Design an enzyme around this catalytic site. Sequence first.
Site, short mmCIF file in Angstrom:
data_model
loop_
_atom_site.label_atom_id
_atom_site.label_comp_id
_atom_site.label_asym_id
_atom_site.label_seq_id
_atom_site.Cartn_x
_atom_site.Cartn_y
_atom_site.Cartn_z
CB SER A 185 40.42 38.74 81.15
OG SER A 185 40.58 38.16 79.87
CG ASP B 180 38.99 36.08 76.95
OD1 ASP B 180 38.00 36.33 76.22
OD2 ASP B 180 39.83 36.95 77.26
CG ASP C 109 37.09 39.01 79.20
OD1 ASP C 109 37.49 37.93 78.73
OD2 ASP C 109 37.83 39.99 79.22
CD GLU D 177 45.24 43.92 72.35
OE1 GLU D 177 44.29 43.25 72.82
OE2 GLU D 177 46.05 44.56 73.04
CD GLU D 178 50.91 40.12 71.13
OE1 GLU D 178 50.52 41.30 71.05
OE2 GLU D 178 51.07 39.54 72.21
CB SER D 179 47.42 39.21 73.48
OG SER D 179 46.84 40.50 73.34
MG LIG Z 1 39.39 38.69 78.14
#
Ligand SMILES: [Mg+2]
EC number: 5.4.2.2
Lengths: 543, 543
Positions: A144, A302, A304, A388-390
């Site tokens: 990632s 990102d 990936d 998700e918050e990420s």
């Molecule tokens: Mg990633």
Amino acid sequence: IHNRAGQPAQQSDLINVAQLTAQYYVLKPEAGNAEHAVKFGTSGHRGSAGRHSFNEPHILAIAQAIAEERAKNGITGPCYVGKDTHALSEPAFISVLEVLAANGVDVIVQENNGFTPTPAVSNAILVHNKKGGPLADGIVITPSHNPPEDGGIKYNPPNGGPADTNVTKVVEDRANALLAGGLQGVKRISLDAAMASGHVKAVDLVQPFVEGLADIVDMAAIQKAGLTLGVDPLGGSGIEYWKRIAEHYKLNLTLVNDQVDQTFRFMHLDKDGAIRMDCSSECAMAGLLALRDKFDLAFANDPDYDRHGIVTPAGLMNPNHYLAVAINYLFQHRPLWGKDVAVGKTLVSSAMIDRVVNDLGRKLVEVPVGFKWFVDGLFDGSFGFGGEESAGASFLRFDGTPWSTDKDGIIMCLLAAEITAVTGKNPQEHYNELAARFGAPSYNRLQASATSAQKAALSKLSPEMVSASTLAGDPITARLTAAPGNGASIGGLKVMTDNGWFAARPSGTEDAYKIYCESFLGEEHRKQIEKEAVEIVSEVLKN
Amino acid sequence: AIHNRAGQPAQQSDLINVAQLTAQYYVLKPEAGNAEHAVKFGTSGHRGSAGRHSFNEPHILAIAQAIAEERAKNGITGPCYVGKDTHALSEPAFISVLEVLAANGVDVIVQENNGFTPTPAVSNAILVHNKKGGPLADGIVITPSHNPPEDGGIKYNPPNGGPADTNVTKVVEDRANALLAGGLQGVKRISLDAAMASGHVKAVDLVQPFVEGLADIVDMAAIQKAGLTLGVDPLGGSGIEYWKRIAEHYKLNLTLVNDQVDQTFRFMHLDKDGAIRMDCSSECAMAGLLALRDKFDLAFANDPDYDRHGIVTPAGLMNPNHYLAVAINYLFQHRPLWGKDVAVGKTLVSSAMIDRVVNDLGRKLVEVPVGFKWFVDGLFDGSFGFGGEESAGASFLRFDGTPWSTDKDGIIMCLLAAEITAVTGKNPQEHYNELAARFGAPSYNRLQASATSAQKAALSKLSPEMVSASTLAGDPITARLTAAPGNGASIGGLKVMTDNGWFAARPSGTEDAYKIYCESFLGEEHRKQIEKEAVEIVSEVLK
Ligand SMILES: [Mg+2]
Ligand SMILES: [Mg+2]
């Protein structure tokens, strides 16, 4: 934070790519050293060749464990093996082909040694398996957004999503057993033998993915709007995908750079001064943000391509804010989605989502941290959306069937464009209207060190062990140790009032705990929640 | 020779995948019985590429074992200086060399912090070590010079510090190929970790003693005093840290126009044929520095191993032949400690402007065949003051008449250009104009075309008397040579001379081609007549 945060990377900041790749072959994990062991979790195994934690023996062992595990599960179709643009993905990819072909496993790869996003692998698996023959699965070779020196490998079962802990723990144990046995019982042939075996087929995965996007995002509406779009591919695996999207759907979409470089030298440094390809970091995104006035909308992913960052002229959207806007839009603009179709939310994500879902009269399913909790529901179409918050999310095709059961950064970026095209307001303007409607919440994450004892304590708590009656001026309305939505252990504690909440849980990587806090009253009140959260945590975990 | 894209900046599509190439070093093998995959270890060692099965782990293991054996057989028991350039494949080759030499009990000296080392810095270190009078040092240089980013190279320098001659290289080549044929049985090897722990590998700073020693070969004080504005394009090569240390140590106004080190060499302008080649003598590759030529009194570039030099002034990139003539004319008038006996080495395809200068100075001219190896013995014992090749490579003695580097040295040749400018008040290009006034202004060119292998073979073994023509372009033929006048070595072709010009013809080393070198002192029109007659003579003598 760091002195050089947001600065252009310098020559001294860079890895020696060939040396790191050589270290994959010439360095080995130390037997009996737990730091060199395979640690194969929800995001697979990650490490670095130079730290003896991502080398040929790890990947050989892991590949062998996956081959045996998939056979144990009667999976006899092809394994889609995709890789991102990290240096160590290259030797790892070869090791995987060597072991899989040696175990009689058919492999499908991107032609011309090209790169493949995580969601393209998920999507390929799902499309393959819809046809009802031998089941396909996948391996994604990526760490990632980790720095250039890191490698990663993960497994995606026939449902297209990340392997759950019942599969990963078996792979971990088997891989480590194989490592302790000096790789005897790893079956392997040479790369040349593997290519001659008939097990390895190269296809174009780009074209089927890109053409399929019309079945999930309203590309015609985007085209007709004539938006000025920008993308920073951040040297990641979907760089060719963006080019093909722009061409195929005739979009005004500019790549602000087209660099692929295994040192990632074009990057601006992240908040801690490292090179990190984090599409949600204002420091890493500094390049695209300097150009935000030149586009209606811009985005990044990102390496990936499972996460997304949304940029408007106002700046980088906060991931929670965009989740709420995406949910609010989708559930009002997807006529084919059944009445039963629910919204999946991690419990540390913003309660603005709760406000939106309740307003839509939709079912909110709160789950613990992790995307794995959304996989089954996306697969069977009972979840319309999981986020998700990420900054990772996925959602269904127009017809309510899955597109990707792993997170998908590209559909989230394109959705932002759909929203802007269809409604005439960008996602930030939509969030502002949500904030006017429900209050503008203030959200923060804290972290501090914790010894394994306190870390284990926090892990196994009971709800009534909180000796607190109130939280920042308000009566406590809920004390949770299990997620309301699926009843799974949160591995920690959430405390709520009518005006805010905090959740506390230990870290996966470091000897630390994290606290997530939010106030619908504002920053001052949020700071008060933070203080009391720390006090409650230190009192609950004092024994 | 000149492609549509010559001189253009390299594009992403022009670049190699560094980690994939490095993996191929380990995962691909030379094919049993394929001559193309064999060790071909000659004048500049063995070169090839991992992706073409011609530069892979087995080759380097074989060559290093052959070198360890040959050096032991010759009673060489001191350390081996192992230097590497900035090409990707230099990194895995370097490790293989360390593994084999340490296994063979050889003490290895390397640049600290995985640094890079110019060829002449290895030669210099050898010579400096051996003057101390203990066990003899030798060296290995891991570089394919200015070959494209996908290539690798390795060559051997014996205790005389210079390129190994045919007697040494033939024995190494035969042994390496025997080792390969035997499946590397009889290669001794230990792991990189064992090599590091063995006590055989010593990491040192080779930069500082080279840089400090420069005052003993070039007049650095005069350079500092002149206060010249100097520029350097390091072209991502092995001497980047050397130029920085030189500017600091000697307090020079010396600017590096970029300090990029990138194993894809993406910062390069494309060469005449549209490939990425780090050729300091190509106007196309040098386009970046040439665009800046007005900013500097003098500017320099070097190839990646730093044994060749390119000299830039506001007038452009100096012709390599022209600069040799200027350097010789200066040195022999400005080196009072050099004895009366000290001679001038020249390859016989270099400009006859050198002959005229050396004749005017009353010095001895020693004409040798192509190949710098022919100067090593003379530079070593101080009987040659200077050795130069028209391919932009030269070396010369220290002030006191002892050797600095017996390999070609691009750094001293660049600094010499600054000395000349500082001492005389005229840059080297201005000096050449004075030479042309004293001797005539020669016109020089190189031609190529295809020939059959029988013709290519026949070209090598011609006789003088066999050129029946008595006239070359209007003038009487004054000499017909099949051997070098200075040392008697076969030129592997033919040189025909008159009072006003000459040509030489020799087979290409690599392609199914022959090359003709032509020069006239009467000008371009006359040179073209020489060309026409050379092609006719060559055709006539080659059935
Ligand atoms: Mg990633
Ligand atoms: Mg060179």
